[PDB]
């Protein structure tokens, strides 16, 4: 896999990214279809993944932590002193 800003794993090979309830044959519709009729009659007897995709893998999955991360630092800014 690749690398990024410290704890930021990008895509490069095979990894376990973010999961989403949208696989084939599930509850309440949600289906898909792959490249099934592509190899017909004569073909190359070799299976391999095709194409690529650039996705992200995170672990926070929270949008309300901004206040919890800013308010303590907001109060620390008052007690902080510049040293120069």
């Amino acid at each position: 896999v690749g690398w990024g800003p410290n704890w930021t794993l990008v895509h490069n090979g095979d990894k376990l990214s973010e999961r989403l309830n949208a696989e084939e044959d599930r509850d309440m519709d949600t289906i898909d279809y792959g490249f099934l009729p592509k190899p017909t009659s004569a073909k190359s007897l070799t299976e391999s993944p095709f194409k690529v995709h650039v996705e992200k893998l995170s672990l926070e999955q929270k949008t309300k932590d901004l206040q919890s991360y800013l308010l303590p630092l907001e109060i620390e800014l008052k007690n902080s002193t510049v040293d120069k």
Binding site: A42, K43, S44, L45, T46
Partner: protein
């Protein structure tokens, strides 16, 4: 005459009466020191006033510059005349005049050091044709003004050669088909290349592609289609292809109607690859890809050449195109 305005008026009257009596050699042979710029301006004003049927004021300016040793001025005048002819008419005559002007400008630029290889935009101005009714008498064109010097962009020798190549390609298209002059006057480089390929002017097509730095995928597809048609055709198709390919390659082996055009096309591809690049294999890649898309493996001499070159690329391409037996034998 001491008065400058009266001198200019007298020069204008002299130009008028000389163009009326058809006596241009007098003004050509008459030298003009210091007042050369005034004479040039007077002739330019006369050319902007009248049309181009009464002699050629721009050719007279070119002759005067040649007599007074002004190669850059002569080249700029020739380029302006060519641009005006192109804006007036886009037909075969206009294309020929533009080609002549481009060639004269290139010669004038090469006659001097490369430090003057770039020229600025010519002097603007319109040529009012036929004073009386309509100021613009264009049978196949719009207006008659050269590109103004607002966008300061000096035209390099590369751009001049590109314009000359485009004009000569338009002229060749018009010669190969009279009903395509006005079409090529506004067509695109890709359409020009496709027309040259479908006609048989592969030399000019390759020259245009090398000058434009474009791609050769369409040319390779056309060549593969022609090879397939020659392989699946008969003696009539062979003769029809010879009638257009008899003047393209260097006839090293004596040509005859016995052998088909397969070896001729092979030697043509060899010569084209040697003239292009002896190391780049993208041309061979596209050729064999189009051949496999048509439905026939690459010839034995292509096989031998690319085997003496590489091998893993052949194995990968065979595994991708489902040539399992050939790939297995080759890797063994």
């Amino acid at each position: 005459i001491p008065d400058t305005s009266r001198q200019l008026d007298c020069l204008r009257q002299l130009v008028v009466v000389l163009c009326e009596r058809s006596q241009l050699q007098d003004l050509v042979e008459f030298p003009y020191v210091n007042l050369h710029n005034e004479v040039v301006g007077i002739i330019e004003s006369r050319a902007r006033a009248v049309d181009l049927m009464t002699h050629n004021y721009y050719e007279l300016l070119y002759a005067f510059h040649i007599y007074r040793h002004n190669y850059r001025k002569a080249g700029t005048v020739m380029f302006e005349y060519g641009m005006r002819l192109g804006r007036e008419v886009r037909t075969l005559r206009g294309l020929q005049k533009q080609v002549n002007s481009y060639l004269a400008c290139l010669n004038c630029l090469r006659l001097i050091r490369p430090e003057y290889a770039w020229i600025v935009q010519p002097v603007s101005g319109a040529v009012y044709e036929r004073p009386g009714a309509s100021p613009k008498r264009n049978y196949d064109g719009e207006s008659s003004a050269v590109p103004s010097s607002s966008q300061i962009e000096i035209l390099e020798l590369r751009d001049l050669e590109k314009e000359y190549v485009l004009a000569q390609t338009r002229l060749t298209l018009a010669k190969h088909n009279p009903s395509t002059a006005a079409i090529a006057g506004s067509s695109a480089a890709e359409e020009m290349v496709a027309l040259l390929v479908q006609a048989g002017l592969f030399d000019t097509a390759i020259s245009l592609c090398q000058t434009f730095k474009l791609g050769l995928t369409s040319i390779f597809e056309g060549l593969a289609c022609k090879c397939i048609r020659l392989q699946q055709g008969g003696e009539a198709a062979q003769a029809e292809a010879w009638e257009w390919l008899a003047a393209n390659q260097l006839a090293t082996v004596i040509t005859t109607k016995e052998s088909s055009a397969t070896d001729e096309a092979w030697r043509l591809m060899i010569s084209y690859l040697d003239k292009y690049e002896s190391k780049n294999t993208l041309y061979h890649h596209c050729i064999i890809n189009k051949l496999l898309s048509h439905g026939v493996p690459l010839p034995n001499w292509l096989i031998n050449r690319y085997k003496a070159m590489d091998a893993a690329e052949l194995l990968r391409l065979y595994l991708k195109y489902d040539l399992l037996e050939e790939a297995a034998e080759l890797v063994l």
